[PDB]
Amino acid sequence: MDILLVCLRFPFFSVAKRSYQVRTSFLLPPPSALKGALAKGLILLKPEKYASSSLDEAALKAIKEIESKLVDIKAVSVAPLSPLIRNAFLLKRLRNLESGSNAEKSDAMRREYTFTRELLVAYIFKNLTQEEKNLYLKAAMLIDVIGDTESLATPVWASFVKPEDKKAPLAFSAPYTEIYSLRMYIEKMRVSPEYSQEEIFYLPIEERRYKRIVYYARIYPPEVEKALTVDGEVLGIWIP
Amino acid sequence: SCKAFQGQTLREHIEAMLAAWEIVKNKYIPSIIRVMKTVGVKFTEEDADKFMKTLIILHDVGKCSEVYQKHLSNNEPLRGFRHELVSAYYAYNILKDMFKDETIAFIGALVVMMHHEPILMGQIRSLDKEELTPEVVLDKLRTFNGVMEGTESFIKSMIKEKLGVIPKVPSPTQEDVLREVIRLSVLARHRPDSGKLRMVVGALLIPLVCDYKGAAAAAAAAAAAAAAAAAAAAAAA
Amino acid sequence: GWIRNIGRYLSYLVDDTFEEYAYDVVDGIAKARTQEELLEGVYKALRLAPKLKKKAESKGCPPPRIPSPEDIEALEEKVEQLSNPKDLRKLAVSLALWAFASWNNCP
Amino acid sequence: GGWIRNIGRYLSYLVDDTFEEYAYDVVDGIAKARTQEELLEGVYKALRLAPKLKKKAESKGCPPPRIPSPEDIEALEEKVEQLSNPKDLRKLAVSLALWAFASWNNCP
Amino acid sequence: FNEFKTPQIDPIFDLYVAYGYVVSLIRGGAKEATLIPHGASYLIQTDVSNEEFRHGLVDALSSMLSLHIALAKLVSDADFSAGANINNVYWDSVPRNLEKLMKDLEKKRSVKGTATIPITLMPSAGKYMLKHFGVQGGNPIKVDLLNYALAWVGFHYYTPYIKYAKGDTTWIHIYQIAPVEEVDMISILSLKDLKMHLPHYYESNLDFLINRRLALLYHLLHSEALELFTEKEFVIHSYTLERSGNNQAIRSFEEEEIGKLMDFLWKLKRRDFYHAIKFIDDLLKKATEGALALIDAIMNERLEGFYTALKLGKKAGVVSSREIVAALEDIIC
DNA sequence: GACCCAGT
DNA sequence: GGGTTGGGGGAAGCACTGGGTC
């Protein structure tokens, strides 16, 4: 078992949930956004295999390949090491996609996002071969923009790690399907995107106030036999 | 022997209320039962006798908490201190064991601290000359470092001497009074019944405030303050 | 706290009962940050003593009491080791905060 | 440290009443100065009026003013040479002038 | 132990529907109840039967209909009719659903219809969603009547709102407290006291209601509710429904925390009470632009904010009491 | 895609 | 130093594309 761990130090979030007027955002990036960000990196880097007429099937084939090289439906998990905070932004979201209402119809919608300082992303595989190991290592980097086209993410590093059954409490997200013994925190997460299903994941977010602010601290769930160590700070990963 | 007034102690203060009340029992109890029956619990006039006795006996027991004594010594101001609110937590558990329920213990714990100066639960216009404020009384509550040992057994000294039910006292240090005085107020403020938790609690309050004749007079309108102190004509001779 | 006995003098130059209305000194002392303008601003406030002395007598109330020198040195001895703006503003802002009071002593 | 109060007591006799002497010009010039040279000039102008005030207080019934000790002159002299930067010069320029206005019991 | 299941739709809508569960179980008793937070699920743990839950709802909706019919297709001026409701189409549609359960809950029959949630209870609603390409028609978010009725009951009693119209335009600010670590009947019932019924201020003298961050202070000022937040932990969520020039849209939506504001007011209104409200009301009415500097200094402990507001307000009119100045330095020290 | 609405 | 005045009134966001139904 090999886990590809990367670090994304991007200040403000990019994802927006299914919402109008306000644009609610996830506290941690959805797996679908990460799947898209990694899939789009293979096209401009390896265009000799991603031949498509349009973008609609171009995304579909890349997502299908990513799912094929995946152990299960669970795409990828993230670990926050910084206190998340829910910011407030007011953006322009024009509404002119209906059969009418002239051409210029734009008003202000509160498209607010979330701020973090440190974040890890752990992709999971099934001991892939070497000839594509380097390709995926190079593809893990070069993630300049995530979510929408207004915020940029900057990767830091990328390396493979073994579980080796080390003692550490769970830190990355995990689906809430059969895990009950692990203050518990689950929301709609939308691991699987749609292009014309919805699973519930456990997210490691808890609010703790010391004297002034509440932010989002760590819930420290019960220890899981699977975990990975990095830069001294060991974090627990849930593997099916 | 903890004194309750400037020159009057709590001991004779209790008998002053009893000597005011031996005649009030035959005027309000048949009228208080018919309005009490709305809460769900029901009992005869004999149980109402002991209920009103338990309320009158502990109404201002919180006046001995090493705070009132150090204030009323020579000239020290109260600084917005409330002496009787802690008595509420004394009046909550005592009714829990001698009635073996909660629906009648809750109203007692409210009426015991609806007197003197009740707490104002928000909704002010622009001003408050008086000190009916939870924020300023919490500051004076924060200094409550328990109660003296002299009142530990003292509570056994007036309940056994008149009727006698069961000996039981609580042990306030910092927080048992807190999460009770807060819970009673929060439960009394928001319930499906709108006006009952006001009119019935005031109805129970009314016979408890006959203390004016018990203590020294302080206002010139004493004639109108004792209209119900008398009764109708018994006979001709 | 050597503050209650000095804030009432600072309040003498803002109250309506003394109509001179000099906020320049209050603005100078409120925005004092590094080492020096905090001691310079309070000089302007403490200088205008005659003003208040004459103005209280011009209406009938007793002359205002000038703060005692028994605690003025508490600012000089504190500003020395508190050179950084981390905790120096922490009291510089309170000095100007105490200047906006009423202190109704001239009915 | 210690001499500031002593010099401020002397400066207090120039702005207080019961003396018929009000000279704010020098106390203003001492504090809100710009250069080290004029600091000692203002100190001299303030200190010069020692004999004219040392005798009138007892004539008016007030106790005589306590002249600052000559040892404090050594401290105020030896404090200014090594400190030439204007960054922390104004603070000492106004420190001694602050104590001019206080509650000194000049005429009990 | 029953553990009534709560559907997860929106982090704000689920707050309203689940947090409104208590107003019905209180009417039916439900002793020894609790509410375990989940960030958005907010599940109620109570060892009570399901039958009394509908007995709570029938009483709650009787109260709603009594409030609605009292004031005045019929449109009232209540929170659930025209107070926080920015859209006129829901002025009569919403009450019609509320009385509809009178033909469903009284004779012990489950819900079968499904209504459309307005924007007031849940801001993420709308008309133009995005699925793969372009937009659609109508409101795809359709809420069953069971969860639909459970939201208004918690909205009317618990979460407050402030309305300031000024003729054609209209500003509505909605604030609600969301538990994040633990909560009990002591806190959820206390939060009910914060509700402002009929917050129609209008005129021109009361203009201080400009901006949500300034209206929250005025709402909080005249409500000296329980101060348990000094030992507990809670978060304030607020959203606006602007109708400038009959244009229903949301232009302000920020997330803040209420604990520090609780502590600020608790430490302020302790030395005296008569003058503190007068001072803050004077600075709010006169120093309209200056009270923003005072409110902003509260969530970040800004030293210059404690002075700028007073400086800008004293020029017009300020009592400037003595005991309240010592209250600020209690926080400062 | 053309309809709807408010009170000091 | 010894008195007269401390703001004065007026303004303190219009229009502009409303978002839901049906």
Ligand code: NI
């Ligand atoms: Ni009494």
